[PDB]
Design a protein around this ligand. Structure first.
Ligand SMILES: [Zn+2]
Ligand SMILES: [Zn+2]
Ligand SMILES: [Zn+2]
Ligand SMILES: [Zn+2]
Lengths: 363, 365
């Protein structure tokens, strides 16, 4: 019967796809306890045009009238500085998401993190419009050449100098290292923020998923349902991520990277789709971690305050002022999330018990 | 055509299962270029009795009369020193294979490698009978307690102290660290063999698979068909394995760990079966590596000489004196291996090119 008032919760890294999948999962943002969602653009084809991002947002709002949607473009050679200014001036986007080519779902149209300079006109326009640059910070794999090989376990660490160069070259650009998975990345974000004294001083932040606070390599070795990018790494990495999430620092906040796939796309003998589905119980998953760490006092900062501050979400843009309330009523995660038609998704931690449930309080 | 006479080739780590799968796969030992096969025992139930291992060998010999079968027991709670002596004296087994409990396929009846002491009477009997102790050298994963976490990436390295203690405590026992996957393991096998002058000096050997000479973690992360145990690890590990395989050292030789699974046991969202199926093109896979490494002169040692020497295979045990001839005919690995009934297997490197092919020639002398 214990309750925690989390206010206007934020999930700053959401995939809702299109079609019937989108109709199934978009109402789960609210059901999982999230008021505000930052919507990723890696559709097929990626979202790179104004009319597409406008229609997509209106489609989400039709499906969930109480959810606040922040939208993004997919970083691509199709983008122009003029397009960035137009989209920003119409409040059609809040940021631009960068996928390195080949590293994850629908990243074939993505970029080379060896030649980010080709997108400096875009970053310049984003900086002028106070838009956020979201990075999938993994270098593409390479096992040859003059250089130490890059593989799924060190690809994030190998990306960190690209992060530092972007922050150096665009010091007023807000940049997010999305879904951090390595101890090395946590330390880099902390070191970048060494001189920050209030939350509004943060320019470079990192999001943390629910599933990387639980998983290590042992959990997805043999279990495609736990396979995502960046891959869950070693116990020392998991410990560093959990310490960061409960740290109370303004430069870490919640982004689930909830990535829904129909079960048949996870049960492949080759080319398994990467992604973990956590939307249905997003805030309860996080509460489990914060309870185990005796850090529930810091839950609201991680899932509400810090994301709102970083994205400068105004009360005038919220779709609903309802507050998310956690209450300590145990529940069992179902085996599947289904639309009763052709889509079944296996949820993260299917079959496990969670100590907290989430409801909504007006005003 | 360029040809290499590989003679009596051996694959010292073979799974052929039972029933219809066995009927499909056992003929592929010969088709893949292998004369001598060491047959692993992790059946359901595991092979732990004399009559079972005798009847199993008879089944295999019927399916492949020209293949030489060396048999093993599974290291289980039920094994007794008297049974080791009995099976050895009847030439019913050449060794005993140890699976750490829970680490891989049909390992639930296996051991705790943290307390091997309960099996020391078995190892003493094996040592007296000159039987080989085959180790799946991985410690089971542990994430609780206060000691070192163990996970799929360091479980082999974590096992290496256990290997050294067994070698120290049973210095005359032939021991194989099966399917090595880590640079750490290669270094340990190399240092155990620091003072070895000829092949017959080797007491502790290691087998290397075909697929660990190709694969890294990147290749199985989203590809269940490439998932096996021990998992393929980092590029630095694969570098060490390939260098060991072409080293010409007598303490490394070929064991495929070819592990057939029906495709439906790989296309799972959880509990993907561990194992790569390499039998159908076993020797051509290895030839690919030795060619790319410019070490084809060392191929015969890796796939024939060293395994025959370590297991002390005699001409009198040999089911057929046919010689395996590698010839430089490019070929394309199929997408599926099937029996035309209910079984389809995805072979290793399905769809790829191989520079070599294999055929058989009689001994005419
Ligand atoms: Zn991503
Ligand atoms: Zn994502
Ligand atoms: Zn094994
Ligand atoms: Zn095996």
């Amino acid at each position: 019967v214990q309750e925690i008032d989390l206010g206007l919760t934020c999930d700053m890294h959401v995939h809702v796809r299109e079609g019937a999948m989108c109709e199934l999962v978009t109402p789960k943002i609210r059901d999982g306890g999230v008021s505000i969602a930052y919507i990723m653009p890696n559709l097929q084809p990626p979202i790179t045009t104004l009319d597409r991002v406008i229609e997509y947002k209106k489609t989400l709002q039709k499906l969930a009238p109480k959810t606040t949607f922040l939208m993004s473009f997919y970083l691509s050679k199709d983008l122009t500085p003029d397009l960035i200014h137009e989209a920003a001036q119409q409040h059609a986007i809040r940021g631009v998401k960068c996928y390195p080519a080949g590293v994850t779902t629908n990243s074939a149209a993505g970029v080379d993190p060896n030649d980010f300079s080709a997108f400096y006109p875009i970053f310049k326009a984003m900086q002028e419009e106070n838009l956020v640059l979201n990075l999938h910070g993994e270098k593409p794999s390479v096992h040859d050449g003059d250089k130490e090989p890059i593989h799924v376990l060190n690809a994030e660490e190998a990306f960190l100098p690209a992060l530092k160069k972007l922050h150096n070259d665009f010091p007023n650009l807000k940049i997010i290292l999305e879904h951090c998975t390595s101890e090395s990345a946590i330390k880099t974000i902390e070191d970048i923020n060494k001189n920050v004294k209030k939350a509004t001083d943060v320019k470079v932040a990192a999001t943390l998923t629910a599933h990387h606070l639980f998983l290590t390599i042992d959990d997805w070795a043999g279990n495609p349902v736990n396979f995502c990018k960046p891959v869950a790494k070693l116990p020392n990495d998991k410990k560093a991520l959990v310490k960061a999430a409960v740290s109370g620092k303004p430069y870490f906040f919640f982004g689930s990277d909830s990535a829904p796939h129909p079960v048949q796309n996870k049960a492949n003998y080759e080319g398994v789709c990467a992604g973990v589905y956590s939307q249905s119980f997003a805030i309860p998953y996080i509460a489990q971690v914060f309870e185990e760490q005796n850090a529930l006092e810091n839950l609201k900062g991680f899932v509400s305050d810090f994301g709102i501050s970083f994205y400068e979400v105004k009360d005038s843009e919220v779709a609903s002022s309802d507050k998310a309330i956690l209450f300590k009523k145990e529940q069992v995660i179902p085996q599947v999330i289904s639309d009763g038609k052709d889509i079944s998704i296996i949820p993260f931690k299917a079959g496990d018990k969670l100590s907290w449930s989430v409801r909504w309080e007006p005003r």
